[PDB]
Design a protein around this ligand. Structure first.
Ligand SMILES: [Cl-]
Lengths: 187, 190
């Protein structure tokens, strides 16, 4: 009744959420499950997260296509032959066709209480909102943008926090919920 | 400075939030303010909330919505009774009547809604918020604009859904309701 969970993490730039998932999951044993990241993927060679991945003995598989369907076909290919049981989108800034979403079990992190504040400007719009609560969400990746089945979400009270303090709470709640997210899926 | 905040409370049924308002605010003095519910109004004569009001010595004005042909004539009578009560703020606590501009343009009012607005507007919030794939839910208090359930939000609280049944989910909802509504009224007057 034991499990070795192989994970793939996709990124396009910084490598923050990528590095946070490694420290808490890569080859770490948590409960009855053991986890390892078998794939780190990037679409831009100049991204810094590649050298961040090299800090865990993890080489990174590297707008180079005029065809999205042809591009996503390679993503699916790499994830599958890695043996990854789950793909985790971490700062991956690209639009994924059904070529990916129909054939890859993937999860994504969103800095808002879905389905509220979908899209990029979630943190900004949620702070300026007259709502008094905010949070972060983890959901499955579907054909519907940020509309996949919600896995987990945590809510907090905005109060008199400045935008800096508010944003720092979101980025902290993310680093909590996202590594935790993978765990619940297999427990 | 010590104003006498007059409150009008509108309800339709059990009156749990009404009773909770009375228990925390009626003839009670918090901070600089001394609150007094000067009107309890219901549109149903058989509502149990009337009995809860009697404990505090308050009679409930009954305005049967079936006794009037239009929502407007029904509303003009609500207005006059709130006006002739001298209330400073009208609190909608389980008041299940749509309100025409006759009310909304003339009465300064707030409303309690058992969901995290602007999500789950309407009278099926608790059931929809439970069946939803969302892992959090809660309640909201908002000003009463012309837009149904769309007024400016003044208070919100959330709880994690986790593993509550709908019976337990509903309890937690009404639990937060009883806490957040009287606090909202206090927050407005400080
Ligand atoms: Cl996103």
């Amino acid at each position: 009744n034991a499990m070795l969970v192989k994970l793939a993490v996709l990124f396009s730039g910084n490598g923050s959420n990528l590095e946070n998932i490694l420290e808490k999951l890569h080859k770490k044993t948590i409960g009855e499950n053991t986890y390892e990241i078998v794939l780190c993927l990037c679409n831009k060679k100049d991204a810094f997260g590649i050298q961040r991945a090299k800090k865990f003995g993890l080489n990174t598989v590297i707008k180079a296509y005029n065809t999205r369907e042809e591009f996503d076909t390679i993503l699916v290919q790499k994830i599958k032959e890695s043996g990854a049981n789950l793909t985790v989108l971490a700062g991956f800034m690209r639009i994924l066709s059904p070529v990916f979403t129909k054939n890859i079990k993937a999860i994504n992190l969103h800095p808002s209480l879905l389905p509220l504040f979908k899209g990029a400007h979630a943190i900004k719009e949620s702070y300026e909102s007259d709502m008094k609560v905010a949070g972060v969400s983890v959901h499955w990746v579907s054909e519907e943008l940020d509309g996949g089945m919600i896995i987990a979400q945590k809510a907090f009270e905005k109060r008199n926090l400045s935008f800096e303090e508010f944003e720092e709470k979101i980025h902290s709640l993310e680093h909590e919920i996202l590594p935790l997210s993978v765990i619940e899926i297999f427990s």
